[PDB]
């Protein structure tokens with residue numbers, strides 16, 4: 001097979017092109033598109049507004065112009081965003097400015113892709129090697145990263161947990177242990193549907209503080225408590241339901257297995273462990289590699305999660321997938337009992 005001239009062009013400009021995506025990141029971070037729409041239309045205007053090196057900005061703008069993000073500045077026209085480039089305006093619903101924003105979590109973590117060689121060699125995440133602590137520990141301690149990460153997730157939205165909370169009968173459940181519950185979305189939606197239910201959420205310090213507030217706002221502090229803990233350590237209480245809501249997919253087979261054994265150990269006799277989790281080919285492989293490189297996890301099919309659960313000492317007892325309007329993906333509750 002013989003590479004065409006069009007093949008080499010696509011590899012240089014697109015697939016092998018590391019330079020342009022960093023230019024787009026820098027344009028988002030500097031709010032370049034917003035500053036042009038706000039009246040700026042000369043390189044030195046823009047440089048003035050962004051506290052950047054005029055000459056170096058010119059050179060970044062040159063490149064953004066070639067690649068179709070900006071137009072103008074004919075060297076006499078006014079510098080301006082293209083149709084494409086308006087994706088980096090602040091209010092655009094696709095939020096691409098925030099995705100690419102280097103202050104934000106996703107773009108900041110994307111930089112770790114420079115260590116992808118190591119990630120393919122060892123199967124370990126690159127995030128720590130670049131920033132000094134692993135991804136969730138980093139987010140826990142730095143609120144701007146955690147809130148920028150959350151804002152981009154559809155799970156952050158108001159009614160995001162209503163559907164999964166509706167797909168499961170909570171009426172006889174006494175105590176939910178919500179392992180890695182984040183800011184408490186699922187548990188709050190559970191507690192509201194089941195007034196006698198008690199909850200314990202286990203989190204790092206960052207999300208724990210945000211859950212304390214969600215549970216107070218919701219009139220739930222009396223029966224839903226927040227404990228700072230490490231779900232690699234033994235869990236601080238037992239429960240007739242243990243809940244892992246969008247947690248497993250962040251962890252390697254190895255890690256996800258030590259978490260699950262930790263949950264089984266906390267599971268009261270006869271109790272249930274619930275895992276809530278879950279052109280087109282491109283976006284899943286993109287997410288998959290981010291998941292791998294950011295934190296060492298992966299999107300795991302139903303069967304995979306079931307054998308994984310199997311080696312932690314759990315048998316499947318029911319599955320149930322469904323859609324919501326609000327979630328761009330379908331969700332899925334797997335329900336396990338202890339085999340012993």
Ligand SMILES: Nc1ncnc2c1ncn2[C@@H]1O[C@H](CSCC[C@H](N)C(=O)O)[C@@H](O)[C@H]1O
Pocket residue numbers: 136137140155179180181182183185186202203204207229230231232244245246247250
């Ligand atoms: N060692 C650890 N101990 C407790 N929580 C941890 C942890 N490592 C990561 N986490 C937490 O795991 C969560 C995963 S994402 C939030 C999941 C939440 N249950 C939801 O429904 O969306 C993060 O909030 C992160 O703080």
